[model samples]
Target: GIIEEKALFVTCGATVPFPKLVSCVLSDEFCQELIQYGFVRLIIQFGRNYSSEFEHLVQERGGQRESQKIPIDQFGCGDTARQYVLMNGKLKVIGFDFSTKMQSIIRDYSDLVISHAGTGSILDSLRLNKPLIVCVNDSLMDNHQQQIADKFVELGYVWSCAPTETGLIAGLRASQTEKLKPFPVSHNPSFERLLVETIYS
Candidate 1:
C-alpha cells in the first residue's frame, strides 16, 4: 500500500498540541487567522545538562553506522560522545534554535553539540545513511519544526512526531509492529557544500 511507502517507523526508535492558548479577545475570524500562525519569542538562555545517556551506552546504540572512538558514560563524559553519531567523522548537526528557554533545556535532552541558533541547520545524516527519529516538545506544535520534518518526510527522507511521551512510545511500538518502507532522499553538493562555500568564500 502507498501508506506503507510513507510508513516509516519514525525513529522506529524513540520518539503536538493546539491551544485555547491565545487568550486574546479576538473574534472568530481573527481567532482563525491567529491559529494559522503563532508567534515564538524565544528568551534564548544558556544551557543545563541533566543525565548522561550518550556516555552510558555507546556500542549498543551506534549499530556500526557511526564510528565511536571511546565509550561515553551515562553522563556523556570524555566529551566526544553523541546520540546518533553521523556518517561524517564528528557526527555533525544543524537545526533551528527555538529559544534560550528551550536551549537551556537541551542538556536535559542530549549532551552533544548543537549549533544553538535561531534559524536552520543542514542535516546530512540522511544523505550519509544515518537514520534519526524526530523528538521534541510535543505540545509546542510549531509548524516550523513540522515543516522541517515534513520536508524530509515528503522526500521520503526524515520523520515527524507528535511531541509527547505517549507519542514517542506509540511511534516506537508502531514501527516494531510493521516492516519498514524506505523512500528517496536527495544528496547533491550537499546543502552544506553550497552553504559552506557561501559562508567561507
Candidate 2:
C-alpha cells in the first residue's frame, strides 16, 4: 500500500556502510519520537554494508513491525523492500535489502536526511535541499570523515556530530530551525585535472 502520510527518509547512503551510525540513529529514542509528530516512517538503506551483529539486532527489533517499539525498516543491498498498510498503524516497520529508486525516494518522499558523513550522501541530500544531520563515522579505515564533517558544518551545509554522541538530538532539532544555506553548484569539467595538479603538479 502507498504511504499517503508524510515521512522522513533515514539512510546511510548505499556506498559507505557505517553500521555504527545506523545503530546510533535507530536506537535513538528521541529520533524515533520524530515519527509521531507527522514523520511517519524512516527508511534505512544499508546496502550490503553492516555486520552480522548489526543484522542480528535488526532482525530482533526491526524484523517485525508489531514487535517493534519505534517501528524501523532496515534494508540491505539485495532484498525486496515491503511495507504493511493499516488505518491505525501505530508503528509500521519493514526493512529489506534492495532498492533502485533512491533519488525519487530522497527527493519526493523524504523531509529530512540523517546519514553518515559521506560526500555522496551529502550531495544527494543537498541536491534535494533536505534538512540533513550528518553523524561522523570514526570507525572508517581512514579518519577523514571527521574532517569532512567539520568542513560540512563550517560551510553551513549540515549539522555534524559523532554517531554515538549526546549531541545527535540537539543537532537534529537545531537543523530544523536553522536557516540552511543553499548548496553551491559546480560543473568543473577539469576536476580530474585539478586533482592531478593538486597532487602531482
Candidate 3:
C-alpha cells in the first residue's frame, strides 16, 4: 500500500520577489518542521526573476537540485518547476518563478498554502477552501499589507504571521489545529449598501 502524502505550497508575490519569505521557508529548520507535520512536499512559487537566487538558497540549505524529469502526476505543476530532494529524501522541494495556473495547482495538489500578504493570493487560497497562513513581509515598512493580513486574521478567514522561522512554525502548528470560518460570499447586499452610504455621505 502507498503511504499518504501531504504538501505545503508557499507563494511569494507573482510580480515581485519576496526574499525574506523565500529564505525563511527554505531554511533547514523550517523544512524539518514541515516534515514533522507530515508534509512530504513543499512547492514554492518564488516570484519573478528569482530563479538563480532561489536555486542558490536551496543549495545553501543542502537541497540537491534534481535534473531528472519531474513526473506530472507526482509533482503536478509540469516542466515549469525546478525540483529538489531534501532532508535525506523525507521532503521534496519545488520552486518556480511564476505560474498562470495557481488556482489549479492549489486546488489539486496543495494541502496548505503559506502566502505573502497579497490580497489576490489570500483570496485564491480562501476561495478554494484551503487552509492558509498569511505571512506579512515585515521588511516592507510602512506598507498596508500587514494591515490586510491582520484584518483577515481578525475576520477568522486565515492565520497571520511574520516571515520568520518561529512565526511560520507557529502558524504551521496553528493551521494543523485551528478550523477557520468560511470566507463570506462576494455579493453581500448589506455590505454594498454600507459602502454606497459611506461613499455618498
Candidate 4:
C-alpha cells in the first residue's frame, strides 16, 4: 500500500492541561495548515481530567467520530485513543489523557512534535532527533515555562512560541523551514555547562 502520511504529535503536560495550546492546534485554520504541510495525523495527549472537554471541543470543531481503528498501541505507548476524522478524512486525530510511555509515542509516531514547555516532554522529542516546537502555556501563573522555552530557542535546540493561533501557525512554518541545531548529548560537558548558565543566569 502507498501510505505517505506524517504524524504531528502535541503534548500538553500530563498533570496540568495547556488548554490554550490544545485549542490552538485544533482550530480549523491550524488543522488545515497542517494538512497543507503533508501531515495526515495529529495526536494530542491533552492531559488529566480533560477528556470530556476535549471530546466536546473536537466535536464542535467538526471532528466526526471515526470508526476506523488507529493503531496507537503499535507504538508501545499503551495509550488508548479516541480517533476522529477531520477535513473530510484527510486528517486523522488521535487523542488521549495521559500515557506513561510518552517517550515511546514520540519516538515511534511523531514526525514533528509540538510540545508544552515541560522539560520531560521537550526532551522526549529532542532526544529522538525530531523537529520540535515548544509552545509556552502562558496561562500559567509561574513564568518558568516561558523562561525555559526562551532558553531552548536561544540555544538553537528548538523553535518556540506562545500558545496562540498566530504564534502556533508561525512556529509551524518555522519548523517546516528552519534547521535547528542538534540537541547536545546528555553527557557533553560543554552542553551541561551551558545549561547551568542558562538556569542560573
Candidate 5:
C-alpha cells in the first residue's frame, strides 16, 4: 500500500547559488535516508540555483519518479529527484524552482521546513506554529543570521544546525516531536507608554 507519508519542504533561501547545499540534499544517500524516516514527499524549492550533475539526475529520474505521494502541481516552478526507488517504485522527491505559491502551503502541509536562517522565514513559520530546522549560512563573510538563529534556539523556537549533512540530519531527528514555545507577542507596557509619552511631549 502506498501510504503518503509526511512531507519535508526544503528551501535553500539565498540569492547566491549554494549548489553545495542543494545538491548534497538531493543525492542518492539522502533520498534513501529520507524514506527511512517515513517522508514520502520532498518538495525542494531550489531558488534559481542549478548544477549540471543535479540537472542530469533530475532529467534522468524525474518523469519516472513522480509519485502520488507528491501532489503534482502546487509547489513547483519551471524546472523540476533521485536514484533510489521505493518498494512501490516511485521516487521520493519533487524538485522545483522557487515559487510564492509554495509559501502559501508551508504552514498547513509541511511537516518540517528545512531552510536557511532568515528571520522573516522563521517568523512566518512561527506564525503558523510550525517546527523549524534552520541552517545558518556561515559561509558568508558578513554572516549574522546565526545570531538570530541562536536566539530562536535559546527561545526553543527552532533547532539550529550547521549547513552540513550531518548537522541537518541531526536537526531533523531533533525536530521530530519537538514543541516550540509561543512567540512573545506582548511588548513591555511601561516601555511602550514611556516611548509614546516622550514622542508626544
Candidate 6:
C-alpha cells in the first residue's frame, strides 16, 4: 500500500527552486537515480490529542507511538526522540505535543517547533505551518533522524538556530499579517505520482 503524505514543509531558503526539486523525487522514487541521489520528503507527526483511536490506527498500520519525552536540554543537539518540548529559562516559552489543547493554545504565543525526530518534525511543520528547526541529536539514532531532516531541509522549513525572542516576535507579528499557505497538507495521490515522475524523467 502507498503511504499517504499530506504536505511538505521545506527548510531551505527561498533561494532554491524547491518545487522542481521535489517533483523529480516523486516521479521516479524507486529508480536507481532516486535510490542513489535522493530527493525530498515530508514528515508528519501525531499530537498528544491523537488519542487511543489514532493509536489504534497507527498500530494497524505497523506504526507505534514513540513517547514525546526528552530531557529539556537534549532536544535540539538534534538528538531527542520525543516530538516536542517545553523549555524553561528566562525564555518562558512552551512546546507541547500535538493535542487538541496544543492546537487550541499555539496561537497564544510565537515559538519555533524543533524536532529531533527528523521526519516527524517535517510532518509537523507541514501540518502546523510553524517555523520548524531540525537536527538529529547526539544519541544512537542520530544518524537516522539526521539523515531524514537533512533531506527535508532542502525544502526550507527547518532551520539551524532557535528563533530568538526578537525573531519569534517578528514571526508572530508576521503570522498575524501574513497569508498562510492553505493547509500545507495535501493527501492527493495525483500530486504524489507527479512528484515521482518529476524525480525520474
Q: Give the alpha carbon lDDT tens digit for every residue of 66-91 in model 5.
A: 43333333233343422234444545
Worst 10 residues of 2 by lDDT: 188-197
Ranking under lDDT, best-scoring first? 3, 4, 5, 2, 6, 1
Query: lDDT tens string, model 4, 1-201?
Result: 115556777665534444443556677667667767776556766444433244355567666765445453222123464676764766677765354545556667657777667566666456556667776666664645456666775665466676666777777787778656557435332233334324575
Candidate 3 vs. true structure, TM-score:
0.70
Clashes of each: 11, 3, 0, 0, 0, 28
> What residue runs in model 5 are displaced by over 4 Å at the alpha carbon?
48-55, 59-89, 95-99, 143-151, 154-157, 184-201
TM-scores for all candidates?
Answer: 0.29, 0.64, 0.70, 0.69, 0.63, 0.28
lDDT, candidate 1, 107-172, per-residue tens: 233221111111122233333232334544345434354444545545553333443344434444
Say which prediction, candidate 4 or candidate 5, comes out ahead on lDDT.
Answer: 4
Candidate 3 achieves a global lDDT of 0.59
lDDT of the structure predicted as candidate 4:
0.59
Model 5 pairs in collision: none
Per-residue C-alpha lDDT of model 2 across residues 1-201, encoded as one tens digit per residue: 335666656544334544454555565453455553455665655444342224444454544434323323333233445443223454454544333444555656656766665454456666566667777665563645355566776665467666544677667777678745666434332132234224565
The candidate maximizing TM-score is 3
Quote the positional error of residue 196 for candidate 6 in Å.
Answer: 25
Off by over 4 Å in 4: 1-3, 14-21, 49-52, 67-81, 143-147, 154-157, 185-201
> Ten residues in a row with the worst lDDT in model 3?
188-197
Select the stronger candidate by lDDT from 2 and 5.
Answer: 5
lDDT of 6 by residue, 38-95 (tens): 2122222332211111122222323333464434332222222423211211111122
lDDT of 4 at 28: 66
Residues 101-189 of candidate 3 have per-residue lDDT tens digits of 45556667657777776555556555556677777766664545455566775665466677666777777788778656667434332
Candidate 5: residue 31 lDDT (0-100): 70
- Segments of candidate 3 deviating more than 4 angstroms: 14-21, 49-52, 68-81, 142-147, 154-157, 184-201
